[PDB]
Amino acid sequence: VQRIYLDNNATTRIDPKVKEIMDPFLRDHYGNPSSLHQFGTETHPAIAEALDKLYKGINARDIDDVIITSCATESNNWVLKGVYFDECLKKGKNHIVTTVAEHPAVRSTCNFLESLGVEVTYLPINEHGSITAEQVREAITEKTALVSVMWANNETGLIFPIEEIGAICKEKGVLFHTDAVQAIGKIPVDVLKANADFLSFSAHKFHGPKGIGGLYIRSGVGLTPLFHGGEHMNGRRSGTLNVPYIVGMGEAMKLAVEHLDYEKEVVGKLRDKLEEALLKIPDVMVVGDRIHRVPNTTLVSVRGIEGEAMLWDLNRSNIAASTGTAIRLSLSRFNTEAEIDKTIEVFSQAAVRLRNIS
Amino acid sequence: VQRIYLDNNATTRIDPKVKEIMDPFLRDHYGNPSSLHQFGTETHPAIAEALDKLYKGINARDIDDVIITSCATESNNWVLKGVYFDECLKKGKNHIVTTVAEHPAVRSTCNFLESLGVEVTYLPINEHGSITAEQVREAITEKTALVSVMWANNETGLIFPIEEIGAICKEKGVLFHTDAVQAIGKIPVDVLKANADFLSFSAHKFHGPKGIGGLYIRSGVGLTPLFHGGEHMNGRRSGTLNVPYIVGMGEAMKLAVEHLDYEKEVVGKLRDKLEEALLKIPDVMVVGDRIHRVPNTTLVSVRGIEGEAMLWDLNRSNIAASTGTAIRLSLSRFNTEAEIDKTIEVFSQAAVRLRNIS
Numbered sequence: 001v002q003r004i005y006l007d008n009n010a011t012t013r014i015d016p017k018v019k020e021i022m023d024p025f026l027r028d029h030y031g032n033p034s035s036l037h038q039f040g041t042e043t044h045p046a047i048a049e050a051l052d053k054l055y056k057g058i059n060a061r062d063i064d065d066v067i068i069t070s071c072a073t074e075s076n077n078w079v080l081k082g083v084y085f086d087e088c089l090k091k092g093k094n095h096i097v098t099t100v101a102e103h104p105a106v107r108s109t110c111n112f113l114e115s116l117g118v119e120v121t122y123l124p125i126n127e128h129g130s131i132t133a134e135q136v137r138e139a140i141t142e143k144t145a146l147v148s149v150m151w152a153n154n155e156t157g158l159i160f161p162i163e164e165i166g167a168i169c170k171e172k173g174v175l176f177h178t179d180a181v182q183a184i185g186k187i188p189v190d191v192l193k194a195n196a197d198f199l200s201f202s203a204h205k206f207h208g209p210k211g212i213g214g215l216y217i218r219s220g221v222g223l224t225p226l227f228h229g230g231e232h233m234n235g236r237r238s239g240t241l242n243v244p245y246i247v248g249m250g251e252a253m254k255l256a257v258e259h260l261d262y263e264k265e266v267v268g269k270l271r272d273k274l275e276e277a278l279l280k281i282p283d284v285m286v287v288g289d290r291i292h293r294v295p296n297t298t299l300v301s302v303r304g305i306e307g308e309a310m311l312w313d314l315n316r317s318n319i320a321a322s323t324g325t326a327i328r329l330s331l332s333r334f335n336t337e338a339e340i341d342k343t344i345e346v347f348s349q350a351a352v353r354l355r356n357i358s
Numbered sequence: 359v360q361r362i363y364l365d366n367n368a369t370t371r372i373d374p375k376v377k378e379i380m381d382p383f384l385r386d387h388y389g390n391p392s393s394l395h396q397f398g399t400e401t402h403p404a405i406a407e408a409l410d411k412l413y414k415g416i417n418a419r420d421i422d423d424v425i426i427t428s429c430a431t432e433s434n435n436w437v438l439k440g441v442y443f444d445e446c447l448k449k450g451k452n453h454i455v456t457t458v459a460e461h462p463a464v465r466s467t468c469n470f471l472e473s474l475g476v477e478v479t480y481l482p483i484n485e486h487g488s489i490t491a492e493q494v495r496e497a498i499t500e501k502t503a504l505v506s507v508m509w510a511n512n513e514t515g516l517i518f519p520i521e522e523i524g525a526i527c528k529e530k531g532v533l534f535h536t537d538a539v540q541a542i543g544k545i546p547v548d549v550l551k552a553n554a555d556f557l558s559f560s561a562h563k564f565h566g567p568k569g570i571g572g573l574y575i576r577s578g579v580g581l582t583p584l585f586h587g588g589e590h591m592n593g594r595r596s597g598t599l600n601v602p603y604i605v606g607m608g609e610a611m612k613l614a615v616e617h618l619d620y621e622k623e624v625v626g627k628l629r630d631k632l633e634e635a636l637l638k639i640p641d642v643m644v645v646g647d648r649i650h651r652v653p654n655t656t657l658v659s660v661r662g663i664e665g666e667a668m669l670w671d672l673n674r675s676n677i678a679a680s681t682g683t684a685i686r687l688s689l690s691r692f693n694t695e696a697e698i699d700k701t702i703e704v705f706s707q708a709a710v711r712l713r714n715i716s
């Protein structure tokens with residue numbers, strides 16, 4: 001059989017060099033990096049190389065932290081529940097601004113925060129699909145503790161004007177968090193450009209394992225731990241390190257940035273190939289702006305066919321993709337022109353076969 | 359070279375069958391268990407078998423939850439920060455009772471809670487080393503929201519009278535949490551016997567990977583999420599599942615309980631062998647009760663030699679162990695009588711060589 005994987009915004013295959021690099025930490029280098037003896041200290045260089053990889057990947061400096069967490073869901077909960085205690089309670093700033101596009105980790109967390117009496121402005125998205133920047137200017141009051149906007153959208157692939165929000169954020173002395181989960185490996189990421197205080201990411205969107213991620217915290221910026229016990233990660237996040245995943249996610253980030261050109265000019269080309277080949281059907285609208293998207297995503301709709309129906313069918317022919325109803329097709333560097341040609345065929349055939357019904 | 363590993367209360371080697379069982383989830387079964395297509399659904403049986411393994415390991419029933427988390431540090435933070443919102447705030451019960459023996463995850467979390475104005479009673483430990491039970495009877499007031507006592511101590515190996523506390527807890531209508539991290543694989547565990555509402559554990563203490571653990575939540579018992587986004591784990595803990603680690607930790611628990619006899623009557627025998635062979639030196643006190651300990655741990659002290667000094671030396675001869683100052687030696691089923699004989703030698707030689715100094 002030959003299955004075709006087009007659901008990379010949901011998760012990604014672990015790159016072989018990633019699996020390879022973590023292996024020794026699953027086999028004989030199983031010591032606790034906190035231990036003082038050989039088993040512990042032996043793990044130190046490999047963890048250090050991994051972290052360097054992380055910092056170079058997001059252009060973070062020595063004075064900043066990139067804290068290892070168990071996923072972006074953790075990072076997101078941590079940023080919001082931390083500003084809550086640090087700013088909303090202790091400092092009166094009882095308002096957070098965010099978008100309606102944000103991943104449920106941020107939105108649900110907020111929903112809980114307003115449960116406790118925080119006022120949260122959920123920015124609505126325009127006809128362009130995206131968020132303006134001026135929208136956050138206009139919403140930042142002076143109770144405003146944090147603004148959270150995701151770098152790229154998981155559903156549409158749309159890039160948001162981070163930097164702009166970065167600047168409108170610096171100028172107004174407000175805390176700025178970007179959930180950058182769908183941007184690693186997909187476009188260049190730079191916390192310095194973005195004047196981010198906080199950035200989230202998750203490894204399994206750039207070919208490392210599920211079960212690990214990162215929060216960039218800028219120097220001097222405080223954030224009350226979500227995992228108290230303050231032993232690991234400079235006391236910022238307690239719990240025995242996930243050695244294998246740390247090493248692996250490091251390699252993952254490195255390869256992710258080293259493929260940024262390829263993502264740009266190959267996967268993007270394959271995406272365009274698929275997309276415009278798909279636009280030659282009936283009422284095959286693409287959903288949203290088509291210029292400010294990550295290279296790998298396309299979100300198409302179809303005449304009278306539910307997205308859910310088209311996907312179930314595509315599965316039968318061993319093609320994997322998600323909703324977004326419309327149909328989200330998200331590539332990676334592992335896809336091939338052969339596959340998308342195949343996809344074009346299987347897509348169109350499914351399309352007109354599902355519509356036959358009067 | 360031949361290193362001897364005696365630091366199992368710090369972390370454990372991943373059992374080979376564990377590494378083996380997770381492998382396919384690092385290679386071609388990398389789908390998101392939430393996806394609706396083949397890549398996702400394919401992972402379902404293996405996750406289900408893993409969870410069954412977890413439930414059978416702690417004698418939890420169908421109506422209870424065993425929620426996957428990223429470690430015991432997460433579980434501990436989750437129980438305490440959840441009762442805070444559910445009971446302390448929303449319901450007036452502003453008091454938590456716990457021990458001074460507890461792992462810093464629980465103690466630090468509490469320290470933060472009293473920072474917000476919770477009254478936390480830290481129970482002191484007796485000359486016996488342990489906690490009475492009557493001590494928690496006497497401390498449970500009516501603002502009392504939760505009592506948290508660890509099943510077994512990481513430092514001394516001492517078992518606490520869970521069940522007794524279970525009963526004193528049922529009777530007084532108080533929420534009962536046991537951190538059981540050092541009890542899995544070491545003695546039988548039973549939430550039913552223990553009348554636990556909450557139980558924490560971490561895989562890397564019973565030969566699975568660092569970076570995963572569990573919280574048992576009893577049916578009908580609520581606990582406000584620590585990871586909001588409510589998609590995975592019945593909305594109780596959001597974040598993409600850590601597929602490989604889940605499968606592995608399942609196998610880990612299974613093998614852990616299947617070795618409970620061996621832990622009892624082999625590793626315990628090896629521990630006794632080491633311990634009484636070590637008691638034949640000078641002022642080689644063992645620290646604490648010696649009857650109510652898990653089979654694998656011994657915590658010995660020495661005349662005038664600092665523990666830290668003895669450990670540094672032991673490392674040079676490739677023997678790994680921790681402090682607890684005194685000296686904690688924690689075995690696993692992977693140790694061998696050959697090793698402990700060797701240890702006896704290397705220990706005594708180090709002892710009298712470090713003391714030579716006038």
Ligand SMILES: Cc1ncc(COP(=O)(O)O)c(CN[C@@H](CS)C(=O)O)c1O
Nearest residue numbers: 009010071072073103154181202597598
């Ligand atoms: C922007 C963003 N932020 C957070 C997450 C979740 O990360 P975790 O590693 O699961 O915690 C995701 C992943 N959303 C996937 C799976 S639910 C999708 O199908 O769109 C994301 O895209």
Ligand SMILES: Cc1ncc(COP(=O)(O)O)c(CN[C@@H](CS)C(=O)O)c1O
Nearest residue numbers: 239240367368429430431461512539560
């Ligand atoms: C009772 C108990 N509770 C929690 C933990 C920490 O679990 P994590 O998986 O790191 O979150 C531990 C592990 N304490 C180790 C390493 S710090 C020791 O050397 O004693 C524990 O023993």
Ligand SMILES: [Cl-]
Nearest residue numbers: 081224225226
């Ligand atoms: Cl918190």
Ligand SMILES: [Cl-]
Nearest residue numbers: 439582583584
């Ligand atoms: Cl919480």
